Design a protein around this nucleic acid. Structure first.
Length: 539
DNA sequence: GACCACGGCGCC
DNA sequence: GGGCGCCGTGGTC
């Protein structure tokens, strides 16, 4: 390689060492590039960030973020990382990617550009005759890296003072319970140590140990275990709530506020692109993809996510996309009809496996269809259905059958793909995204059967993902062409920011933009909500 | 302080 | 139970 004066030729391979992961808090320690066999090093990374029109290299989307925060647009472009993730969703980091395709991931912003190139090469080449895959990299992955980039920069408005209020009130409720339980033990004891509670519940108290842990195999103090001891002791209930409050506070009410960027007053997440096996996205430090919403407590927490004054929040959730995906995927004319007839799956499905005159008088039978559907999706075993839903391992066996009688192609599709899996060694989505599953031909019924569940769910997840992924890529442009922003994405639902003025004129659009991203043998339904905060946006 | 395994749990 | 990522507890360097 030959050392060259900073000014790099048009379209080189970037390379940069941050002072940490989160581009939003990091400091560009070093900036560099690599074209041909010449290494260009910026004596000053910040300024140099000006001589580039795009980010072409690993974690491209990342340097695009910092650039974005410094006022510079600098969009994210080509990126090996993205290509490997498509060839092998197992490929999730630069370290391993290089350590797998020729190169040592180093700490030099220059050795990195020199790694990227040779990597993009080795990789782009490897893409010989991979139409589908390549369609995803060009039509979805590369473009999306940008949408995310803006997503990260934009950040999210969070009502800190509020969350602070919660923290102190909660802190109290927690304490009242800590006292109650501590008494119920005739002596206090750290309540966060599952170990101490084991010795307290099972040993000290004569409570029946229902199960053990996987790794070490101790007596599990799990929620299921305890719920299963609801009746037994009263201390169980109270301990359950304490676990609730503690989770919510510790993981949300407390850590959130401090993560507010001082230069924005907004929460800046990290939406990782190549980190999932199904092609799903995932968010890091902080993860705003698990913001509570079920308990009263978690709902109040959701409130704390408001929008820039004079604006509003737009929440759009794809109505059960995985089932519909399956529908299109499977072919069960009987299932698809249910979705097309604009009928309530859990209601009609229920009205089928029971041969019940119409959809009448089945209050508990609808609680059923849900699990069967959300069961078949990842193959829930009849036993787990008995435990879960109240039924015997004689009815759980029949339900699975009565259900398939109605939806044959599902079963078929399951076995089809499964088979195909072992022959090929991987499974894919509607667009061609594949996930290798080696243990399909494993002798251990235990491991194999698991391999199957993993192996067969991937398509109805990866696909559903690609769907949204596409949508997100389609939408954003018209977004900016409207002055609105894309805040968060949660696998099958989105959250946007529009000004009170156009706010409602945006929903209508985003909806129809998603609903038809890639029409299927069924219609993609989408619910929408608008409000000053996440909870009220009717998410 | 930086960082690991593990049980436990929040969202999809 | 399919897919993620954060959190104390306990314990290492």
């Amino acid at each position: 390689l030959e050392e060259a004066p900073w000014p790099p030729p048009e379209g080189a391979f970037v390379g940069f060492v941050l002072s940490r992961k989160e581009p939003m808090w990091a400091d560009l320690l070093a900036l560099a590039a690599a074209r041909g066999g010449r290494v260009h090093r910026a004596p000053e990374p910040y300024k140099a960030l000006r001589d580039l029109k795009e980010a072409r290299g690993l974690l491209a989307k990342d340097l695009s973020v910092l650039a974005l925060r410094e006022g510079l647009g600098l969009p994210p472009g080509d990126d090996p990382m993205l290509l490997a993730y498509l060839l092998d969703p197992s490929n999730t980091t630069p370290e391993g990617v290089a350590r797998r395709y020729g190169g040592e991931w180093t700490e030099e912003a220059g050795e990195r550009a020199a790694l990227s190139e040779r990597l993009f090469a080795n990789l782009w080449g490897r893409l010989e005759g991979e139409e589908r895959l390549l369609w995803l990299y060009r039509e979805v992955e590369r473009p999306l890296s940008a949408v995310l980039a803006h997503m990260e920069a934009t950040g999210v408005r969070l009502d800190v003072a509020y969350l602070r209020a919660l923290s102190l009130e909660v802190a109290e409720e927690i304490a009242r319970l800590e006292a109650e339980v501590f008494r119920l033990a005739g002596h206090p004891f750290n309540l966060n140590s599952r170990d101490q509670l084991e010795r307290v519940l099972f040993d000290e108290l004569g409570l029946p140990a229902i199960g053990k842990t996987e790794k070490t195999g101790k007596r599990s103090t799990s929620a299921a275990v305890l719920e299963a001891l609801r009746e037994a002791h009263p201390i169980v209930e109270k301990i359950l709530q304490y676990r609730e409050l503690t989770k919510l506070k510790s993981t949300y009410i407390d850590p959130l506020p401090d993560l507010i960027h001082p230069r924005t007053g907004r929460l800046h997440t990290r939406f990782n692109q190549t980190a999932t096996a199904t092609g799903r996205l995932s968010s890091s430090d902080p993860n705003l993809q698990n913001i509570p919403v079920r308990t009263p407590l978690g709902q109040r927490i959701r409130r704390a996510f408001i929008a820039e004054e004079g604006w509003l929040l737009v929440a759009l959730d794809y109505s059960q996309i995985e089932l519909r995906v399956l529908a299109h995927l499977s072919g069960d004319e009987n299932l698809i009809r249910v979705f097309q007839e604009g009928r309530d799956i859990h209601t009609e499905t229920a009205s089928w496996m029971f041969g019940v005159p119409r959809e009448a008088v089945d209050p508990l039978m609808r609680r059923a269809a849900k699990t069967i559907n959300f069961g078949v999706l990842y193959g829930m075993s009849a036993h787990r259905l008995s435990q879960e839903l109240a039924i015997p391992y004689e009815e759980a066996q029949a339900f699975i059958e009565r259900y398939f009688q109605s939806f044959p192609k599902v079963r078929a599709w399951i076995e089809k793909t499964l088979e195909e899996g072992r022959r090929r060694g991987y499974v894919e989505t509607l667009f061609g995204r594949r996930r290798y599953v080696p243990d399909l031909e494993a002798r251990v019924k235990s491991v194999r059967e698991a391999a199957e569940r993993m192996a067969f769910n991937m398509p109805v997840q990866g696909t559903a993902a690609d769907l949204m992924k596409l949508a997100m890529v389609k939408l954003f442009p018209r977004l900016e062409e409207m002055g609105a922003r894309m805040l968060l994405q949660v696998h099958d639902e989105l959250v946007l920011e529009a000004p009170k003025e156009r706010a409602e004129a945006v929903a209508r659009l985003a909806k129809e933009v998603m609903e038809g991203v890639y029409p299927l043998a069924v219609p993609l339904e989408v619910e929408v909500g608008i409000g000053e905060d996440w909870l009220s946006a009717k998410e």
